[PDB]
Design an enzyme around this catalytic site. Structure first.
Site, short mmCIF file in Angstrom:
data_model
loop_
_atom_site.label_atom_id
_atom_site.label_comp_id
_atom_site.label_asym_id
_atom_site.label_seq_id
_atom_site.Cartn_x
_atom_site.Cartn_y
_atom_site.Cartn_z
N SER A 96 -0.44 4.80 -3.99
CA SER A 96 0.56 3.80 -4.36
C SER A 96 1.77 4.47 -4.98
O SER A 96 1.63 5.26 -5.92
CB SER A 96 0.01 2.75 -5.37
OG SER A 96 0.94 1.68 -5.59
N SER A 97 2.99 4.19 -4.46
CA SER A 97 4.23 4.82 -4.90
C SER A 97 4.75 4.30 -6.22
O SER A 97 4.97 3.11 -6.43
CB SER A 97 5.35 4.78 -3.82
OG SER A 97 5.65 3.46 -3.37
N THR A 112 7.03 4.42 5.29
CA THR A 112 7.79 5.60 5.68
C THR A 112 7.65 5.93 7.14
O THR A 112 8.59 6.37 7.78
CB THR A 112 7.44 6.87 4.91
OG1 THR A 112 7.26 6.61 3.53
CG2 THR A 112 8.63 7.84 5.03
N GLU A 145 3.18 -6.34 -8.56
CA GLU A 145 1.75 -6.09 -8.56
C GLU A 145 1.09 -7.08 -9.50
O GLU A 145 1.70 -7.63 -10.41
CB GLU A 145 1.32 -4.64 -8.90
CG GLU A 145 1.79 -3.57 -7.88
CD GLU A 145 1.18 -2.22 -8.18
OE1 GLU A 145 1.39 -1.69 -9.30
OE2 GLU A 145 0.49 -1.64 -7.30
N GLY A 182 5.95 -2.86 -4.60
CA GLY A 182 6.14 -4.30 -4.70
C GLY A 182 5.72 -4.78 -6.05
O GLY A 182 5.17 -4.02 -6.84
N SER A 203 0.78 -1.24 0.00
CA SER A 203 0.00 0.00 0.00
C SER A 203 0.82 1.31 0.00
O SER A 203 1.72 1.42 -0.83
CB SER A 203 -1.33 -0.13 0.78
OG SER A 203 -1.12 -0.42 2.16
N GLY A 204 0.66 2.39 0.80
CA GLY A 204 -0.25 2.79 1.87
C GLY A 204 0.01 2.23 3.24
O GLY A 204 -0.70 2.57 4.18
N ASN A 220 -4.55 0.55 -4.43
CA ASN A 220 -4.73 1.45 -3.30
C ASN A 220 -4.86 2.90 -3.77
O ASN A 220 -4.30 3.29 -4.79
CB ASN A 220 -3.54 1.32 -2.29
CG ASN A 220 -3.81 2.07 -0.98
OD1 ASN A 220 -4.86 1.96 -0.35
ND2 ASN A 220 -2.85 2.91 -0.55
#
Lengths: 374, 610, 187
Positions: free
Chosen positions: B111-112, B53, B336, B334, B48-49, B108
């Protein structure tokens, strides 16, 4: 680095166009001339130099005698040609052929010895990992992005016509017409003497080539334009020699490109560019004519004059069935289309398995060109 | 958890000498960094989310309470100065990077889509020197092209809803998401979202990081400019291949927002000049090439803005001291899996396959050193060779990205042609590449790959023109000459090549001009990230989310299985089953298990325990 | 599902007609031609394809040489015929023969090998639960709703004549006349 890249060189008569594959514009463009010093020089500290190649020959023109090595698609001398390839690789491009696969362009209906000796010079003079020789008209079709069309390709070399349909090629419907822009240069100096302008050496023969590539145009109808030439106006144009002699040319100006449509003017029975295009289409299968008429492609250096497309459209529309709509695609940039076609072709990864390798040459010798390619 | 006592309690011990925690893994990294005098990297997979961090702030809190004493006798080891806390501006750094590089996705709402590499920098005495942020991978395609039910980056939506006339008039963006053709699917208004406030908090965060109002407006002019590109509408001319742009207004609006003369931009984009050694000749571009050039300029402008932004962020991270070595922390997505899996999904899975190969190699060396420590020579295959066939299938001159790279430069190329050529070239020779072959409704997806996580089925639709990033050197050379300081500074090359061998092609420049695919740029950036990670000793954190609900006492088993497949934990268990995973002391084995074999284990003279 | 439906394929020379049982009219009708490329092609990125079947062959006609595999009711080559059945099942109809009983039509006074090889190709090339081969003229009588009549049946295959009376059939009064619409094409 990935792929290494490749080198592409177009060497129809009159102009070398050369550079890397997958560059869209080339990296050298210059005239295919070898200029040797006719007059002995009396000074100390000059050169000497056996010959000047490319634009050094254009610059120092009046001392020299200039030789084209390629005449009518045929290489007439091979030290002069080797020097042109030596000059492209080491002066402008600044590459080692050892780094690069080299693609060369070659002409429809050409003696086998031109392919077979050309592969030998590339393999044994400038050591090269791989190479290919490719037909000019197919490359210009690749540049205009098409799968189907009839290609009218003409340099200062010769005029060639190749019909193509969804890829493929029809070998029996390929036509060669020995009229070049160069024969138009000789016709132009021959017509200029009617107005008293006598040009006689190779140096000012290229001044009439320079007149040819920006004052000349094709008449949109010949008799009509020749009739209005009684009242000289826009039909006459001033021209400046590097001498400072002013040259004024009239009806003369458009009756030079007319020779492509009327080969009677140069004294040859061989039919015009519109008629040779029709001869190719008649040799082609009945169905594919519909799209070939509507997909006429113009390429090369002597298809550059104003009014060629417009005129070819009138003459093909007049000769052909008017039940279908004749369409000619004659793009700008068409002087370079054979080179652009090679730069795209050498950028195809499937074509990277279609190269003639150095190993295949070393194992099986010069004759293998006509056993792997066209 | 995370009090002073718990961090004090862990200090200097092995990971089996105190309960499982992140602080234990950072103690192994800190202790290995001091002992072996080499750089380390913490790799955290992008679930996620998931507060990744936020846990990294606890890692930074751990490093702060450890690293209080070095070389300088009395160097303010308590309060640092007046208020020499941590880099608390690491908190402020996230909404800026999060708006720019995170999006609402099907997995999500946050999402990065970039590889965030945090470098915590230390002197030779184990003290903090400073920190830098580096960004590596970026889904720069996501700006121009999106999935069927996702947002582009949050920054665009929050800009559109937040900005008042006060800043909107200066950017000319009052025209809502229906104007901009690069905003696919339209607005995508989330149920009960105001957006708006989020960028008030973000604008305040930018100003707290010490950047000027002028800089902030100049940055948001270029986040408008990336969108404004999609409003430029080229028209395919009757007969002529080249096309032309009749409607000047969008180019004039772009010229105002940037720096360019409209006349020179219109020439440079439509009919660019290319250097023909040493002259300059014009090149015809088809309508498709001009739209791809505009897309490449948008994707490359956003890439350059992001690279400038991370550099400008590092310029407000003060450096009090020289640095000798670093701890990297990698925060990236990650692996996906979606129903519809497209090109960016293949790119994400490919980076995770290389990152997981580095885990497998690290596990191989850690097992091999442990075999030697116990005096047992044993030879076994590398575990990174499990994934090597999948990596070489995607990578290399005959792989998926290379065949896609050929096909996008082919003169009449199709999605069907790409799949058939890949079938003929490589599928029937490659165990990890599958063509499914049922009729519709059992195989909507067009080809399948077997990766560490399992089979992933891909939809090829539009991959060729997603892949294209051809960049006109004339238009780039106009942007280099910008009268607006920000855009000129962003377009300062960044390729280094013209310093190497001077002004020619001498190997120091890649495919630049024409060509340039997103897959090549992704491979190039990934190889830079992998080289930097391979030059450190790695340690591994795997985050799981137990529910969508956001409250504990519920753990959703299917979600946990999907996360365990994608994050490589299921690979690590199949790897250690190839070896010998269970390792028991001679004393423990005798003391716990004597009850088994009274017949074998004799009298109290049977000491030594071997 | 009930009945599993069935597949019906008519393949007299000149035209394939194919679709489902339970329809009154077919889903695919196309010419029974296999068109191979006579002229070598010089381009990169083409196909290649051994042959074009059906109306891909009709479209790209001038490059090709076209072969009918069925001549005078007789199958003259069987890779060309297999490709036509492969094409009907997987391109237009989009069915697995494993799901469907397949009915094929066949000609009056035809060599036994045409039935015997046709059943082998349907059983062993495209795996099928069941099949049948049925005489063309009796099927056209059923379509016209009649129990009794004399059927004159002629394709671009051959001309066949079958008399029928209240069902039944008279084997000695079945006539075959080797004139087809195809011989009219040559004429």
């Amino acid at each position: 680095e990935d792929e290494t890249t490749a080198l592409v060189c177009d060497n129809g008569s009159g102009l070398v166009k050369a550079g890397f594959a997958g560059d869209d514009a080339p990296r050298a463009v210059f005239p295919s001339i070898v200029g040797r010093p006719r007059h002995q020089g009396v000074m100390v500290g000059m050169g000497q130099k056996d010959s000047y190649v490319g634009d050094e020959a254009q610059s120092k023109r009046g001392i020299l005698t200039l030789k084209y090595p390629i005449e009518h698609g045929i290489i007439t001398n091979w030290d002069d040609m080797e020097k042109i390839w030596h000059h492209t690789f080491y002066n402008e491009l600044r590459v080692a052929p050892e780094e690069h696969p080299t693609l060369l362009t070659e002409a429809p209906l050409n003696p086998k010895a031109n392919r077979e000796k050309m592969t030998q010079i590339m393999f044994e003079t400038f050591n090269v990992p791989a190479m290919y020789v490719a037909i000019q008209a197919v490359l210009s079709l690749y540049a205009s992005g098409r799968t189907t069309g009839i290609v009218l390709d003409s340099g200062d070399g010769v005029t060639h016509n190749v019909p193509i349909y969804e890829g493929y090629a029809l070998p029996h419907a390929i036509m060669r017409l020995d009229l070049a822009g160069r024969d138009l240069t000789d016709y132009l100096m021959k017509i200029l003497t009617e107005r008293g302008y006598s040009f006689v050496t190779t140096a000012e023969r290229e001044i009439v080539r320079d007149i040819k590539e920006k004052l000349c145009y094709v008449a949109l109808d010949f008799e009509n334009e020749m009739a209005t030439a009684a009242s000289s106006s826009s039909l006459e144009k001033s021209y400046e020699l590097p001498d400072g002699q002013v040259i004024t040319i009239g009806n003369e100006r458009f009756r030079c490109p007319e020779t492509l449509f009327q080969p009677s003017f140069i004294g040859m029975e061989s039919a015009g560019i519109h008629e040779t295009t029709y001869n190719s289409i008649m040799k082609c299968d009945i169905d594919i004519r519909k799209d070939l008429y509507a997909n006429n492609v113009m390429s090369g250096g002597t298809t550059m004059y104003p009014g060629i497309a417009d005129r070819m459209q009138k003459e093909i529309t007049a000769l052909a069935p008017s039940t279908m709509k004749i369409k000619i695609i004659a793009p700008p940039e068409r002087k370079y289309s054979v080179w652009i076609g090679g730069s795209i072709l050498a950028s195809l990864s499937t074509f990277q398995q279609m190269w003639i390798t150095k190993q295949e040459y070393d194992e099986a010798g010069p004759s293998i060109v006509h056993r792997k390619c066209f | 958890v995370y009090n002073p006592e718990v961090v004090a309690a862990y200090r200097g011990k092995k990971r089996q000498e105190a309960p499982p925690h992140i602080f234990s893994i950072s103690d192994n990294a800190y202790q290995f960094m001091l002992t072996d005098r080499e750089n380390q990297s913490i790799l955290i997979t992008g679930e996620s989310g998931a507060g990744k961090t936020v846990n990294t702030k606890r890692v930074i809190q751990y490093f702060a309470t450890i690293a209080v004493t070095g070389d300088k006798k009395k160097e303010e080891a308590t309060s640092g100065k007046m208020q020499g806390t941590l880099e608390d501006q690491i908190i402020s750094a996230n909404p800026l990077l999060e708006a720019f590089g995170n999006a609402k996705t099907v997995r999500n709402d946050n999402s990065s889509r970039f590889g965030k590499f945090i470098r915590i920098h230390f002197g030779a005495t184990g003290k903090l020197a400073s920190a830098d942020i580096e960004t590596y991978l970026l889904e720069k395609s996501r700006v121009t092209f999106q999935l069927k039910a996702e947002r582009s980056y949050h920054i665009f939506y929050q800009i559109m809803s937040n900005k008042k006339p006060e800043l909107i008039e200066m950017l000319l963006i009052t025209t809502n998401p229906y104007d901009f053709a690069y905003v696919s699917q339209g607005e995508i208004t989330v149920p009960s979202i105001d957006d708006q406030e989020e960028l008030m908090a973000t604008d305040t965060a930018v100003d707290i990081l010490g950047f000027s109002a002028d800089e902030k407006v100049a940055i948001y002019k270029l986040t408008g400019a990336v969108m404004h590109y999609g409003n430029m509408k080229f028209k395919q001319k009757q007969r002529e291949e080249q096309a032309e742009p009749d409607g000047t207004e969008v180019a004039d609006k772009a010229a105002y927002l940037t720096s360019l003369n409209s006349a020179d931009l219109l020439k440079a984009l439509c009919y660019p000049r290319v250097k023909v050694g040493n002259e300059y000749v014009t090149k015809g571009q088809t309508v498709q090439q001009v739209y791809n050039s505009v897309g490449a300029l948008a994707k490359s402008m956003y890439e350059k803005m992001f690279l400038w932004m991370v550099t400008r962020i590092n310029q407000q991270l003060d450096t009090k001291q020289p640095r000798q070595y670093f701890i990297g922390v990698l925060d990236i997505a990650g692996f996906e899996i979606f129903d519809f899996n497209t090109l960016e999904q293949l790119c994400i899975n490919f980076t995770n396959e290389k990152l997981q190969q580095f885990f497998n190699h690290h596990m191989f060396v850690l097992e091999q050193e442990e075999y030697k420590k116990e005096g047992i020579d044993w030879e076994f295959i590398d575990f990174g060779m499990d994934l090597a066939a999948c990596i070489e299938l995607i990578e290399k001159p005959m792989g998926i990205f290379s065949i896609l790279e050929e096909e996008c430069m082919f003169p009449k190329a199709t999605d069907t042609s790409f799949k058939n050529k890949l079938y003929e070239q490589h599928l029937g020779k490659s165990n990890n590449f599958q063509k499914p072959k049922p009729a519709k409704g059992k195989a909507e997806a067009h080809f399948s790959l077997v990766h560490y996580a399992g089979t992933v089925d891909y939809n090829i639709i539009g991959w060729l023109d997603k892949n294209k990033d051809p960049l006109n050197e004339t238009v780039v050379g106009l942007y280099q000459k910008s009268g607006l300081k920000t855009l000129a500074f962003l377009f300062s090359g960044g390729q280094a090549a013209e310093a190497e061998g001077g002004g020619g092609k001498k190997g120091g420049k890649k495919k630049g001009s024409s060509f340039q695919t997103v897959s090549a740029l992704f491979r190039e950036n990934l190889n830079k990230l992998m080289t930097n990670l391979k030059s450190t000793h790695p340690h591994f954190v795997r985050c799981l989310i137990p529910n969508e609900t956001k409250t504990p006492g519920a753990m959703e088993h299917e979600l946990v299985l999907h996360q365990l497949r994608c994050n490589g934990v299921l690979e690590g268990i199949r790897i250690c089953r190839k070896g010998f995973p269970s390792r028991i002391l001679y004393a423990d084995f005798k003391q716990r298990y004597k009850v088994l074999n009274a017949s074998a284990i004799p009298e109290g003279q049977f000491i030594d325990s071997k």
